Amino acid sequence: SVKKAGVLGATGSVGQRFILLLSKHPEFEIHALGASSRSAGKKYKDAASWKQTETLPETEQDIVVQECKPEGNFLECDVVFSGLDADVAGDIEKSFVEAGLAVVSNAKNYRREKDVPLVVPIVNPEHIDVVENKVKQAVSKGGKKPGFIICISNCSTAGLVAPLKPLVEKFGPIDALTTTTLQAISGVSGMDILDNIVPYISGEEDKLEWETKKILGGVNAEGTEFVPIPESEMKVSAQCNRVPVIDGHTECISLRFANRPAPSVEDVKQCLREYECAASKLGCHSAPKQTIHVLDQPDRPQPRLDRDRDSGYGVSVGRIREDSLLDFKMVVLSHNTIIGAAGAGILIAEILKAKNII
Amino acid sequence: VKKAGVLGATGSVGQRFILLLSKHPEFEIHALGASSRSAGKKYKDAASWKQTETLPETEQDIVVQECKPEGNFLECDVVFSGLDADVAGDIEKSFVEAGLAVVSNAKNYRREKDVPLVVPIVNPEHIDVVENKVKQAVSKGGKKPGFIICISNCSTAGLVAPLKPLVEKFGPIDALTTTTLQAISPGVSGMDILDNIVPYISGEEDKLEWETKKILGGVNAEGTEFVPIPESEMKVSAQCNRVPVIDGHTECISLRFANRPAPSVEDVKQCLREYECAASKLGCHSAPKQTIHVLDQPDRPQPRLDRDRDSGYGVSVGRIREDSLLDFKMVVLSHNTIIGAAGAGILIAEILKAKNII
Numbered sequence: 001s002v003k004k005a006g007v008l009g010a011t012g013s014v015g016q017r018f019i020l021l022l023s024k025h026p027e028f029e030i031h032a033l034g035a036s037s038r039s040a041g042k043k044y045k046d047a048a049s050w051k052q053t054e055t056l057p058e059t060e061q062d063i064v065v066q067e068c069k070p071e072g073n074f075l076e077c078d079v080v081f082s083g084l085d086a087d088v089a090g091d092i093e094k095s096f097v098e099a100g101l102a103v104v105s106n107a108k109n110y111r112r113e114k115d116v117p118l119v120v121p122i123v124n125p126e127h128i129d130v131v132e133n134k135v136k137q138a139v140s141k142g143g144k145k146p147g148f149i150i151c152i153s154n155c156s157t158a159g160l161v162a163p164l165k166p167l168v169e170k171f172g173p174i175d176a177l178t179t180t181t182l183q184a185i186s187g188v189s190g191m192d193i194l195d196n197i198v199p200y201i202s203g204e205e206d207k208l209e210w211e212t213k214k215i216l217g218g219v220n221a222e223g224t225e226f227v228p229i230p231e232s233e234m235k236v237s238a239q240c241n242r243v244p245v246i247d248g249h250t251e252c253i254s255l256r257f258a259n260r261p262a263p264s265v266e267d268v269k270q271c272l273r274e275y276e277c278a279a280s281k282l283g284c285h286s287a288p289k290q291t292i293h294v295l296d297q298p299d300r301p302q303p304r305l306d307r308d309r310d311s312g313y314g315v316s317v318g319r320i321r322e323d324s325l326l327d328f329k330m331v332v333l334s335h336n337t338i339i340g341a342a343g344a345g346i347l348i349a350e351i352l353k354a355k356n357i358i
Numbered sequence: 359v360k361k362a363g364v365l366g367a368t369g370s371v372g373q374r375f376i377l378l379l380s381k382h383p384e385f386e387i388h389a390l391g392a393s394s395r396s397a398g399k400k401y402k403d404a405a406s407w408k409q410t411e412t413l414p415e416t417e418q419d420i421v422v423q424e425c426k427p428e429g430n431f432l433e434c435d436v437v438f439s440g441l442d443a444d445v446a447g448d449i450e451k452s453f454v455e456a457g458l459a460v461v462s463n464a465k466n467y468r469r470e471k472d473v474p475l476v477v478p479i480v481n482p483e484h485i486d487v488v489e490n491k492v493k494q495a496v497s498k499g500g501k502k503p504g505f506i507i508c509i510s511n512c513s514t515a516g517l518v519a520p521l522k523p524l525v526e527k528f529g530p531i532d533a534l535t536t537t538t539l540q541a542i543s544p545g546v547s548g549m550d551i552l553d554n555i556v557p558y559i560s561g562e563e564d565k566l567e568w569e570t571k572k573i574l575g576g577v578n579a580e581g582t583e584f585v586p587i588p589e590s591e592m593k594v595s596a597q598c599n600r601v602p603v604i605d606g607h608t609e610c611i612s613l614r615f616a617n618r619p620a621p622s623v624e625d626v627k628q629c630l631r632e633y634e635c636a637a638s639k640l641g642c643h644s645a646p647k648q649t650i651h652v653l654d655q656p657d658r659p660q661p662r663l664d665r666d667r668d669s670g671y672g673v674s675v676g677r678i679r680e681d682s683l684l685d686f687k688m689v690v691l692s693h694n695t696i697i698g699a700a701g702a703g704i705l706i707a708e709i710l711k712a713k714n715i716i
């Protein structure tokens with residue numbers, strides 16, 4: 001069965017990738033596209049300075065970009081993805097929720113809101129239960145389906161937590177966590193980055209440190225709001241860097257378990273290679289069976305040689321070994337195809353589709 | 359005016375030694391050694407000049423010699439070594455036994471209990487072990503005994519440079535992380551590194567972890583051997599990466615003090631600003647009096663923006679801020695001219711000469 005999909009901020013970078021993906025999806029129909037006044041009225045192909053290495057089909061190319069209001073075609077969408085600029089996403093997404101619509105957003109605005117799930121779909125799909133219970137209890141009493149928002153974490157946060165989930169399931173809570181990122185370009189000018197390193201990405205470290213606590217966190221007794229891992233319970237230290245690499249974020253991570261003793265390296269590696277995410281078990285269309293590709297070569301993963309090879313995995317993980325300060329260190333290569341805003345967004349909608357929320 | 363030898367003169371480290379010595383009035387380039395397939399040839403005909411700056415042509419005409427203590431090598435007041443580790447142990451041993459003063463970049467003798475491992479802007483006082491030994495041999499036999507001082511690689515020197523003043527002021531550091539983003543400056547081809555990250559430098563993390571504890575360690579009661587900091591009292595975790603950058607290693611670092619409670623972030627910044635290395639206080643020519651350059655901009659240091667401008671400091675240090683796991687984190691940029699093998703070696707020779715060990 002085909003659900004109708006809308007895209008807010010459709011002309012932007014993340015918006016482009018949303019439409020590109022949904023275009024190949026057998027379960028979704030691109031029904032409404034939204035951007036600013038500068039774009040409204042134009043065919044998508046004229047509204048968007050297309051920056052993807054892949055071209056878009058003609059039928060999607062001719063679709064007329066609409067204003068970002070819960071109106072006409074947007075009121076007809078079963079799910080509304082959002083890559084809106086944060087300057088406008090606040091007001092707009094709220095009115096979409098108010099109109100009773102299902103919003104899956106990459107905007108940072110509502111990420112830290114207490115009743116809003118912050119979801120890396122290959123890691124914490126269970127955090128969606130909060131909206132699931134709200135929705136299903138509302139409709140069972142005969143009332144109108146409330147409308148809600150689920151937020152998509154960034155590629156960097158998603159890369160950090162991805163290997164952590166199986167490890168936390170098997171060996172219990174992680175109380176200490178470091179990450180130094182080596183982040184790719186995919187604005188950053190050639191002037192800024194060529195033969196250079198910028199040891200600062202604005203807001204990225206606070207994002208990384210705070211979001212991971214919510215994603216790996218829990219819910220309050222009333223089951224309506226999220227209770228992120230408190231600071232006394234888990235320390236997270238991020239250092240983010242831009243590097244002269246076109247595609248694929250690398251993270252050099254360190255971790256310690258709260259429960260003693262630490263497992264063995266082989267148990268850790270075996271845990272990571274064996275993990276199947278909840279979304280795969282639900283039978284979701286865009287979910288990877290295995291979310292992690294464990295690599296044994298001592299110089300792997302590398303962004304350039306493992307980008308395509310492992311594009312079916314959430315992350316590639318290499319150099320898993322015992323640490324000198326915490327328990328283990330390892331190297332993580334994110335894959336945009338799976339854990340990128342667009343890929344994460346579609347999977348959330350599939351999870352919503354299964355479980356009958358949309 | 360001291361006469362200088364260079365072993366493994368044709369290699370990357372040898373080239374840097376020769377170049378830097380030619381710009382130095384206190385030294386005379388007196389002997390050059392390399393492989394037997396180089397021996398008997400002018401230096402320009404023996405070497406593939408991989409440097410940016412060209413050599414004065416009078417230096418180019420120097421005939422390279424076999425790596426043996428035999429002719430011009432026997433008259434050198436200091437012999438610098440840039441031999442590969444698979445032959446260096448044999449040759450450097452011969453030189454020491456011939457009575458010569460060896461300053462080596464090779465790894466072979468670094469872990470020896472009696473051999474100083476020196477980052478001369480950090481632990482020049484470790485040379486006192488050699489000094490007292492030479493003092494002992496003069497009283498006993500009349501002649502100098504022959505010795506090795508080992509030079510730490512640029513990566514270790516970068517880590518330890520800002521730590522020295524901190525430890526002097528606030529006491530020992532019991533925990534320390536580093537993720538490095540290391541410049542090209544086996545080799546490393548463009549094919550490996552361009553538009554890519556290589557999360558592995560062979561032996562690098564091991565050296566970084568072990569050598570730190572010795573460099574920041576002490577001397578036994580008799581002043582005859584080195585007592586590196588016990589593993590339990592300083593946990594050091596390194597994660598080394600190669601990036602597409604020509605010159606200037608970046609290190610993303612975290613540290614915690616053993617002495618509780620921690621100083622403030624303001625105390626730390628000013629401690630680094632006020633540090634003047636002891637080699638500068640001795641009057642050594644190559645030692646930077648402003649050893650550390652702290653930068654206040656949120657996006658600095660950057661290798662390409664700061665490598666020429668800060669080429670006369672040991673390190674530039676930026677983004678000094680409170681940490682959430684350990685006490686503080688910060689971004690460190692190394693300056694090869696000062697703390698690289700050649701620059702470090704010349705400074706050691708300057709200290710040796712000032713202290714009459716020659």
Ligand SMILES: NC(=O)c1ccc[n+]([C@@H]2O[C@H](COP(=O)([O-])OP(=O)(O)OC[C@H]3O[C@@H](n4cnc5c(N)ncnc54)[C@H](OP(=O)(O)O)[C@@H]3O)[C@@H](O)[C@H]2O)c1
Nearest residue numbers: 009010011012013015035036038039068083084085088187
């Ligand atoms: N070279 C140029 O002239 C130029 C132009 C655009 C972008 N860029 C660069 O490329 C990047 C791509 O942009 P982005 O996706 O990061 O962010 P963005 O374009 O500013 O915003 C993302 C999406 O939000 C929409 N939007 C913005 N303001 C809106 C409003 N007031 N009401 C409703 N929708 C609104 C945009 O549609 P609209 O397309 O209608 O604005 C776009 O689809 C930018 O960060 C920028 O650096 C350069």
